[PDB]
Every structure is written in structure tokens, then in C-alpha cells.
């Protein structure tokens, strides 16, 4: 969620200079979001493997 | 005829030994597949032209797969006794109506 990735809701850029830092903020947000989703995918594969073994 | 009754007693122990080894073999097949996948991950990460943000993903994949191997290994027990976790050094089953045994060493995986 917006708090989770550090975006901070109701956070915009009022001038043409805050956008120069918003670029980097969105880059970091995208990086950490993709990392979290990769971890979730790994966990799902683990659940599948263990289910097979339990069978 | 007492001895024939004793043979009837021996056959069940032989069958139980078979069962335990099947459970171990299933877990072992899963473990070998996981080890192949881990080798693939490590080989992919050994590249020096790689970005800083892909190395972390490959490392986390590696760590997940290692934890998976550990779980798959410790769960392979039949009737509380197992020959793949490493709990005991060998299992001895009945093989003769006088007590002589069939020995199966332990192959920890």
C-alpha cells in the first residue's frame, strides 16, 4: 500500500523542482514493490512444493 | 510348526521396512529436484555483468529453496522412524525366525 512503499498519500509536487525528486521517490518505490512481489512469488512456490510432498 | 508361525511374524517387519524406504525415496526425489534448481540459481547469479537489483532476487530465491530442502528432509518420517533425517545410524529389521537381522544403514539427506 502507499504507506508500505513509502509513497505517502496526498504527496504531490507543487513546483517544477519537487518533480526532480519525485522521480527518484517513484524509482525507489517501484524497486521495493517489485522486491516484495518477488518474495511473495517465492513463498507461493514453496507452498506448492510442500503440498505435493504432503500428498 | 512353531517356526512357521514365527516366519509369519517376520514378514510384517520386512514390509514395514519397505514402507519406510519408500517414504524416504519420495522425499529424496523432491530434494534432488530442489538441488538442481538451486544450482541453476547459483550459476545464474555468478555473472559479473549483472545489475545490483537482480543479484538480491537470485539470492532470495536461493534462500527459499534451501529452506524448502530442509523442510522436505525433516518431514520424511513413517511411524516416527526415518532413515533420511539423520536421527539414528542404522535400522535393523527381522530376517530369520531366530532373530538374526537385516541391516539397513542410514543415508542422511
Amino acid at each position: 500500500s502507499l504507506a508500505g512503499i513509502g509513497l505517502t498519500t496526498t504527496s504531490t509536487f507543487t513546483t517544477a523542482a519537487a518533480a526532480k525528486t519525485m522521480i527518484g521517490t517513484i524509482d525507489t518505490a517501484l524497486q521495493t514493490a517489485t522486491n516484495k512481489l518477488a518474495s511473495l512469488g517465492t513463498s507461493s512456490v514453496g507452498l506448492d512444493t510442500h503440498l505435493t510432498f504432503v500428498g | 510348526s512353531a517356526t512357521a508361525a514365527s516366519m509369519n511374524a517376520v514378514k510384517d517387519s520386512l514390509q514395514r521396512g519397505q514402507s519406510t524406504i519408500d517414504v524416504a525415496l519420495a522425499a529424496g526425489d523432491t530434494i534432488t529436484d530442489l538441488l538442481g534448481k538451486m544450482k541453476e540459481k547459483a550459476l545464474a547469479a555468478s555473472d559479473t555483468s549483472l545489475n545490483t537489483a537482480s543479484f538480491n532476487a537470485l539470492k532470495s530465491d536461493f534462500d527459499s529453496l534451501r529452506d524448502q530442502i530442509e523442510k522436505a528432509a525433516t518431514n520424511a518420517k513413517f511411524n516416527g522412524v526415518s532413515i533420511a533425517d539423520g536421527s539414528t545410524t542404522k535400522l535393523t529389521f527381522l530376517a530369520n525366525s531366530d532373530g538374526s537381522g537385516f541391516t539397513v544403514n542410514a543415508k542422511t539427506i
Side-chain angles (χ1 to χ4, degrees):
Chain A
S1 81
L2 281 160
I5 59 176
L7 259 182
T8 294
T9 184
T10 72
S11 61
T12 75
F13 47 103
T14 75
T15 174
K20 282 268 291 152
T21 65
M22 185 63 72
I23 299 175
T25 316
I26 301 292
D27 269 357
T28 61
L30 179 49
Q31 288 198 15
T32 185
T34 44
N35 290 4
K36 292 167 163 176
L37 293 177
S39 298
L40 280 190
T42 296
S43 283
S44 187
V45 176
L47 285 174
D48 182 18
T49 301
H50 189 36
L51 167 61
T52 291
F53 169 60
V54 162
Chain B
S1 66
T3 305
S6 315
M7 311 275 197
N8 189 359
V10 172
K11 295 156 84 176
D12 64 358
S13 176
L14 284 180
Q15 283 173 330
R16 172 193 313 141
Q18 277 185 354
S19 54
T20 69
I21 296 195
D22 309 68
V23 188
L25 284 167
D29 186 74
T30 290
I31 285 176
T32 51
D33 213 331
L34 286 166
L35 277 162
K37 205 169 320 193
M38 293 177 70
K39 172 183 177 169
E40 191 163 12
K41 284 290 158 294
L43 190 142
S46 175
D47 186 355
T48 68
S49 66
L50 204 58
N51 211 348
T52 312
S54 305
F55 201 105
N56 301 321
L58 293 163
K59 185 178 170 309
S60 303
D61 291 24
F62 194 110
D63 292 331
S64 178
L65 291 152
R66 159 171 44 78
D67 306 0
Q68 191 44 42
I69 282 183
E70 187 40 77
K71 296 178 47 60
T74 193
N75 290 290
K77 303 196 307 305
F78 178 99
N79 196 19
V81 179
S82 64
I83 56 177
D85 56 24
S87 66
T88 186
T89 62
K90 64 163 162 291
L91 259 52
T92 288
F93 305 105
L94 290 174
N96 189 359
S97 76
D98 54 31
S100 87
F102 199 107
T103 301
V104 185
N105 288 265
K107 311 293 190 174
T108 79
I109 54 178

